[PDB]
Symmetry: C3
Subunit: 90 residues, 3 copies
C-alpha cells in the first residue's frame, strides 16, 4: 500500500498544495514559488481530495477528508482551517 495524494494550484506563479493521507493523518506541502514547505493543514483522514478557487488574489481551498464512511470538509478562507458545512450519508 502507498500513501495517497490530492493536489490543487492557483495563479501565475503558481502556488501549489499537495495533501498526503498517510497512516490515518493528512498533511500538507506547499509551493509559493520559493521552495516546498510544510503547511498548516493537519487533520485526520485515510482519504483526501481538494479543490480551490480564487476570489481576486485571495485563495479559497476546500479539503475533503474521509475516515471510514465519514467525510469532513476543511475550509481555508485566508486565516485558518475551519470545518465546513459539508455533510453526506455514506
Amino acid at each position: 500500500s502507498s500513501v495517497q495524494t490530492a493536489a490543487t494550484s492557483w495563479g501565475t506563479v503558481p502556488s501549489i498544495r499537495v495533501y498526503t493521507a498517510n497512516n490515518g493523518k493528512i498533511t500538507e506541502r506547499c509551493w509559493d514559488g520559493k521552495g516546498w514547505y510544510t503547511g498548516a493543514f493537519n487533520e485526520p483522514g485515510d482519504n483526501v481530495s481538494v479543490t480551490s478557487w480564487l476570489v481576486g488574489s485571495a485563495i479559497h481551498i476546500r479539503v475533503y477528508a474521509s475516515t471510514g464512511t465519514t467525510t469532513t470538509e476543511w475550509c481555508w478562507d485566508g486565516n485558518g482551517w475551519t470545518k465546513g458545512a459539508y455533510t453526506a450519508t455514506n
Copy 2:
C-alpha cells in the same frame, strides 16, 4: 478502509461537486451556495476522479469511474449524464 472522494468547483459562488465511491457505487453531493444537496449522478465504481470546465456560465463536468481495470467517463453537459468517448487499455 475508507470511502474515496473526488472534487471539482466553478465560478464565483462557487459551485462545488463531491463524488464518493463507496461499496461499488459512486454518488454525488452538490453545493450551489444554498445548502448541500444530493445530486443526480449515480453510477457504479470503486474509484472516482473528476474535472470540469466552464463554457460561458455553462458547466461541463467529466467523471472517471473505475471498476477493476475498466474506466468509464460520464459527461455532464447541461442536461444529464451521458457516457463519454473515453477508452483505455488497462
Copy 3:
C-alpha cells in the same frame, strides 16, 4: 481492487488528461478534441494526483506519483516530463 485515476483539463476545447495507476505503473490517456490517445507519460506509481495551469496557451502539468511513502513530482512544461523539486517527509 480497482485501478486509480486522476484528471485535469484546460482551455476551450478542452484538452483533458487522465492518469491511471495500475499494478505499480502510471500511464496517460489524452484528449485534444480529436480522439483519445495514449500520451507520453509513463512512470512508476501506486497512487497518482495531478494539477495543471496555463501560461498563455502553454500548459504546465504536475503529476504526483506515490510508491510506499515516497512522492515524486513529474513536470510537463512543454517539451517533456522532468522530475520536479517536490519533497516530503512521509
